[PDB]
Design a protein around this ligand. Structure first.
Ligand SMILES: Cc1cc2c(cc1C)N(C[C@H](O)[C@H](O)[C@H](O)COP(=O)(O)O)c1[nH]c(=O)[nH]c(=O)c1N2
Ligand SMILES: CCCCCCCCCCCCCCCCCC
Length: 347
């Protein structure tokens, strides 16, 4: 029995979720040429509104954040209007939705933004090329200056303001999966020797500045953060990364965020450097609402939550394969297994 998945969950004084099931953020690359959410996207999100909370696909804060085709933005008025259709539809269907705010850092590609500079903490290129594209090899980033950083913080904050204009319930800051914020938090990507590198406090500085700027614009109750203490996507591991997160997590707790959310694909994986699974590491160092994710069935998620491993469960691939995931779980119906083939279709 997975009855606990359908508990009401009070995130905070502003937001109460009707159940513990979140739709995980899932890039689909289906926005229009202007990076505006389409009416097909509106329908896609609207039909998943039985989720306690939807986290949107990663949404770029400005043009030089783009690293994949057709990923929506929220920096133009047209994008705001397109997103307003999405949020209105979700709300009309009895749901709630946060936008996931994205900058890809060294994983951006200049093909998407007129040949400009790719930005990152340090000039450390990742291997390979953009997936599902013809020969877009990743490039050596420019190490951002402190002035670049100030502009990036500003643009995260402005994006957050725009999110509220677009009618979202809040923001999940994308601090995970090897993208810009995560790049500051790991030694592979952050080789800086200024106030944004070297020490745990310094490496955490960018993440905390973005969090604080966004809170100052839209409020802590409407601000969550996704993190990846375990390196796994476009990120080489480093035994020293753990102490950065040892510092970051208590600092994050001071901000009384709506939630912290793990970024991983299979949370049953144990990380040597974390002394166990990603969620268990975070749970041991962070005492507020935690969203678990990664290869959980409704059954294993229910048990984890019962055992106080985390509080909310994000579901990704099964929500792609089953738009009616929540109803099927509620009624013990057969779930279709996800296959990569399903990404071609937006249903
Ligand atoms: C096609 C696709 C696209 C995305 C993802 C995954 C997949 C499959 N994931 C990761 C996702 O949120 C989740 O962490 C994983 O899918 C693992 O959870 P499940 O096992 O699928 O429930 C992801 N994560 C994120 O923070 N922002 C994103 O935009 C995406 N994009
Ligand atoms: C990101 C959207 C969909 C991507 C499909 C490809 C898979 C990306 C995630 C990889 C998961 C396993 C990575 C290997 C980890 C090594 C270190 C633990």
């Amino acid at each position: 029995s997975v009855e606990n998945l359908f508990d009401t969950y009070k995130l905070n004084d502003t937001i109460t979720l009707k159940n513990r099931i979140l739709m995980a953020p899932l890039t689909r690359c289906m926005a229009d040429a202007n990076l505006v959410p389409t009416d097909d996207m509106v329908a896609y999100y609207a039909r998943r509104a039985e989720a306690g909370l939807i986290i949107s696909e990663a949404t770029i804060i400005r043009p030089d954040a783009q690293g994949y085709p057709n990923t929506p933005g929220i920096f133009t008025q047209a994008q705001i209007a397109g997103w307003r259709k999405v949020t209105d539809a979700v709300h009309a269907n009895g749901g709630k939705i946060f936008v996931q705010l994205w900058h890809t850092g060294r994983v951006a590609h200049p093909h998407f933004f007129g040949g400009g500079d790719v930005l990152a903490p340090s000039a450390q290129k990742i291997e390979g090329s953009v997936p599902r594209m013809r020969e877009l090899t990743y490039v050596t980033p420019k190490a951002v200056t402190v002035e670049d950083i100030q502009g990036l913080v500003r643009d995260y904050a402005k994006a957050a303001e725009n999110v509220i204009e677009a009618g979202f319930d809040g923001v999940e800051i994308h601090g995970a999966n090897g993208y810009l914020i995560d790049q500051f938090l790991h030694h592979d990507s952050n080789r800086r020797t200024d106030e944004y590198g070297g020490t745990p406090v310094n490496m955490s500085r960018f993440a905390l500045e973005v969090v604080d700027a966004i809170i100052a614009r839209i409020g802590h109750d409407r601000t969550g953060l996704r993190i990846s203490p375990g390196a796994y996507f476009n990120m080489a591991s480093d035994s020293r990364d753990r102490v950065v997160f040892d510092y970051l997590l208590p600092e994050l707790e001071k901000r009384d965020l709506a939630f912290v959310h793990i970024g991983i694909f299979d949370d049953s994986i144990e990380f040597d450097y974390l002394g166990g699974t990603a969620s268990s590491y975070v749970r041991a160092h962070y005492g507020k609402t935690l969203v678990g994710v990664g290869s959980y069935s409704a059954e294993t998620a229910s048990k984890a939550i019962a055992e106080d491993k985390f509080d909310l469960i994000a579901i990704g691939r099964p929500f792609i394969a089953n738009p009616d995931y929540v109803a099927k779980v509620r009624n013990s119906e057969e779930l279709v297994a996800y296959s990569d083939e399903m990404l071609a279709s937006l249903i």
